[PDB]
Scaffold this active site. Structure first.
Site, PDB file in Angstrom:
ATOM      1  N   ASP A 195       8.852  12.585  -1.498  1.00  0.00           N
ATOM      2  CA  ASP A 195       9.193  11.662  -1.078  1.00  0.00           C
ATOM      3  C   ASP A 195      10.050  11.313  -0.062  1.00  0.00           C
ATOM      4  O   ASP A 195      10.736  11.995   0.701  1.00  0.00           O
ATOM      5  CB  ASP A 195      10.799  11.550  -1.748  1.00  0.00           C
ATOM      6  CG  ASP A 195      11.910  10.622  -2.715  1.00  0.00           C
ATOM      7  OD1 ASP A 195      11.513   9.483  -2.188  1.00  0.00           O
ATOM      8  OD2 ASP A 195      13.062  10.541  -2.505  1.00  0.00           O
ATOM      9  N   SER A 205      -1.238  -5.106   5.934  1.00  0.00           N
ATOM     10  CA  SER A 205      -0.706  -6.243   5.019  1.00  0.00           C
ATOM     11  C   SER A 205      -1.360  -6.844   5.889  1.00  0.00           C
ATOM     12  O   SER A 205      -0.511  -7.552   7.335  1.00  0.00           O
ATOM     13  CB  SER A 205       0.223  -6.533   4.456  1.00  0.00           C
ATOM     14  OG  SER A 205       0.184  -7.281   3.705  1.00  0.00           O
ATOM     15  N   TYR A 246       9.796  -8.210   1.885  1.00  0.00           N
ATOM     16  CA  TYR A 246       8.303  -7.477   1.995  1.00  0.00           C
ATOM     17  C   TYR A 246       7.489  -7.600   3.336  1.00  0.00           C
ATOM     18  O   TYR A 246       7.132  -6.345   4.351  1.00  0.00           O
ATOM     19  CB  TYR A 246       7.464  -8.023   1.479  1.00  0.00           C
ATOM     20  CG  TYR A 246       5.822  -7.150   0.693  1.00  0.00           C
ATOM     21  CD1 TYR A 246       6.423  -5.867   0.760  1.00  0.00           C
ATOM     22  CD2 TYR A 246       5.236  -8.026   2.031  1.00  0.00           C
ATOM     23  CE1 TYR A 246       4.429  -5.394   1.587  1.00  0.00           C
ATOM     24  CE2 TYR A 246       3.892  -7.662   1.888  1.00  0.00           C
ATOM     25  CZ  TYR A 246       3.521  -5.907   1.155  1.00  0.00           C
ATOM     26  OH  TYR A 246       2.453  -5.813   1.241  1.00  0.00           O
ATOM     27  N   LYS A 297       6.219  -4.753   6.578  1.00  0.00           N
ATOM     28  CA  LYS A 297       5.013  -4.806   6.923  1.00  0.00           C
ATOM     29  C   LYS A 297       4.787  -5.219   8.237  1.00  0.00           C
ATOM     30  O   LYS A 297       3.876  -4.978   9.492  1.00  0.00           O
ATOM     31  CB  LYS A 297       3.891  -5.477   6.465  1.00  0.00           C
ATOM     32  CG  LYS A 297       4.086  -4.743   4.912  1.00  0.00           C
ATOM     33  CD  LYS A 297       3.470  -3.669   4.565  1.00  0.00           C
ATOM     34  CE  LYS A 297       4.241  -3.347   3.712  1.00  0.00           C
ATOM     35  NZ  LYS A 297       3.390  -1.661   3.561  1.00  0.00           N
TER      36      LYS A 297
END
Ligand SMILES: NC(=O)c1ccc[n+]([C@@H]2O[C@H](COP(=O)([O-])OP(=O)(O)OC[C@H]3O[C@@H](n4cnc5c(N)ncnc54)[C@H](OP(=O)(O)O)[C@@H]3O)[C@@H](O)[C@H]2O)c1
Ligand SMILES: NC(=O)c1ccc[n+]([C@@H]2O[C@H](COP(=O)([O-])OP(=O)(O)OC[C@H]3O[C@@H](n4cnc5c(N)ncnc54)[C@H](OP(=O)(O)O)[C@@H]3O)[C@@H](O)[C@H]2O)c1
Ligand SMILES: C[C@]12CC[C@@H]3c4ccc(O)cc4CC[C@H]3[C@@H]1C[C@H](Cc1cccc(C(N)=O)c1)[C@@H]2O
Ligand SMILES: C[C@]12CC[C@@H]3c4ccc(O)cc4CC[C@H]3[C@@H]1C[C@H](Cc1cccc(C(N)=O)c1)[C@@H]2O
Lengths: 284, 284
Positions: free
Chosen positions: B65, B142, B155, B159
């Protein structure tokens, strides 16, 4: 009749100079809610308001911890005029040091204030702007949100994050009549540049000797860059007023053009190789 | 004698296909520690390892984790060979929806896993690479870390943050002989694209009707982009192997050139106006 402005992070620096620039405006067009994490720090905001002779009723202070959505909601509640025409997201933390020397709490804190905090402001204030079909959001940005700097890994991560957040939002908000702009600051003369790095004893304890040495070298260089390039918060504030006044605001305003070459070099070799080579050379 | 690889996020998608591509390599050069948040999810990693016939002893699973620095430290402890030659930071969360519709916990979670998690990996594993003067770090990136997309605000923020983090680190690490590269992925065929947005009932509850409608429009368009551009994780994995093998790795590898025009447009109008206009047109 007035333009209602709510600014975060007003105890010092850009947020402080902006709030009282707006409040003391010859034309008196602006009602300012100047927010601060800690009201014990509010004195300078009053020393300076007296110096620029802000009218009675121009400037109202509010307590507002951007880490706390209940605090965001309480500050909103206190906006008597029942709307915010200009939201200025300016509260921010710095963090400087070898990555392995930074505490995990400090890392999480910088992201929570700089990034999640701005989200919390936007979540709390955008919905009503979208409904009125009007409103301006101004976010304090940094050149370290446009290019990476050694020893500023987390700080840069938080400012790049703001670029991603705001750019994403802007693509959506365009037909709503809500305008979001980043004000991209280079070095600014305020206070920041010792508060936010540990003692030499602390840092050496937490890194290797070679990294420590490169940190000294970066700091020396950083001091020279500030000495040659740092702008005052007066100049910076005036770019916020430019954006606030533009009938059709762009996503980014730059407070200086100085780093735009460096930026272009970054942007025309997407392998990152030229940037990393140039910056390594420049810093070291 | 082997190259020791530790990969985060191996239960599915790129991390899974990479771990077993490496483990099943005809040449057997690589010892793989494939880490997963939850060992209950480890079955596919074994179904697929059997399919590509990984040798006994090629692939070891570990629980890890990335939100938990004690978990990071326990996984490191378990690296019997006492070094990691290739660290692959791939664990990541998605989040898709109107910003005001996203829970504050989900927002914090995405930043904690995607950004702070990668920091935690780097803090735990870089020091020993800097001392050996060798090591490769590969970070799953990404295209949404290079340009902002509506409804992907958080998101994208996470990134972009990785771009800032890794670029900053790269400027420092250059003379250490430790190589850090981002593998910049466009759309990949895995699972992601429904798991990470609420029910229509939930989202409409939390936003306005016009935003809801624009969300539908974005989703429709997104589905078309995936249908025309999505790469398989096989193709993606092979770019990681390219970077891993390069004697002089660059900061970024692109798994596709498809979005490089869009990127250039972004990069040559730093006001952001052309990008925001083009993307608004393209999505809506
Ligand atoms: N300083 C520079 O050299 C420089 C350069 C480029 C860009 N900037 C940018 O400008 C911003 C501020 O820098 P500045 O020093 O010039 O101005 P600033 O207005 O002092 O902003 C930093 C502020 O953040 C606030 N803050 C800290 N923790 C907070 C929390 N939990 N909740 C709410 N507010 C919090 C502080 O006062 P409060 O008590 O008011 O909250 C402080 O005033 C940053 O976002 C930064 O990118 C500064
Ligand atoms: N999917 C796409 O379309 C696409 C496109 C472009 C880029 N990418 C990138 O590739 C990465 C992964 O996407 P993917 O689905 O293709 O591959 P992936 O290997 O499945 O990565 C997502 C993974 O994150 C892991 N994870 C979630 N929470 C975690 C935690 N707390 N600690 C550790 N790991 C956690 C999950 O499995 P565990 O149980 O193993 O931890 C899961 O496997 C991202 O960083 C993303 O940017 C994907
Ligand atoms: C990134 C930057 C513009 C580019 C500058 C530059 C350019 C070229 C160069 O060669 C060196 C340098 C070093 C200085 C750099 C500035 C730092 C400053 C942001 C800042 C302020 C206070 C604390 C922190 C923190 N806590 O991390 C961060 C400003 O945004
Ligand atoms: C950003 C992107 C490349 C550009 C693509 C594009 C380009 C042009 C265009 O017009 C539309 C679109 C829409 C799709 C876009 C992709 C999304 C994908 C990342 C992703 C995957 C799964 C979940 C999430 C999340 N949870 O947010 C995010 C990939 O990285």
């Amino acid at each position: 009749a007035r333009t209602v402005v709510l600014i975060t992070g007003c105890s010092s620096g850009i947020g402080l100079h902006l709030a009282v620039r707006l409040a003391s405006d010859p034309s008196q067009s602006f009602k300012v809610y100047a927010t601060l994490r800690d009201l014990k720090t509010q004195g300078r905001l009053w020393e300076a308001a007296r110096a620029l002779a802000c009218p009675p009723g121009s400037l109202e202070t509010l307590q507002l911890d951007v880490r706390d959505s209940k605090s965001v909601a309480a500050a909103r509640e206190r906006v008597t005029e029942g709307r915010v025409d200009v939201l200025v997201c300016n509260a921010g933390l710095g963090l400087l040091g070898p990555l392995e020397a930074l505490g995990e709490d400090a890392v999480a804190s910088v992201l929570d204030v700089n990034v999640v905090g701005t989200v919390r402001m936007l979540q709390a204030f955008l919905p009503d702007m979208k409904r009125r079909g009007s409103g301006r959001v101004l976010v304090t940005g940094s050149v370290g949100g446009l290019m990476g700097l050694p020893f500023n890994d987390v700080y840069c991560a938080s400012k790049f994050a703001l670029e991603g957040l705001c750019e994403s939002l802007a693509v959506l908000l365009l037909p709503f009549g809500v305008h979001l702009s980043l004000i991209e600051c280079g070095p600014v003369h305020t206070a920041f540049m010792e508060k936010v790095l540990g003692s030499p004893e602390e840092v050496l304890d937490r890194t290797d000797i070679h990294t420590f040495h490169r940190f000294y070298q970066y700091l020396a260089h950083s001091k020279q860059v500030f000495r040659e390039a740092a702008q005052n918060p007066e100049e910076v504030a005036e770019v916020f007023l430019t954006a606030l006044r533009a009938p059709k605001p762009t996503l980014r305003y730059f407070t200086t053009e100085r780093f735009l070459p460096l930026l272009r070099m970054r942007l025309d070799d997407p392998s990152g190789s030229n940037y990393v080579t140039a910056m390594h050379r420049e810093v070291f």
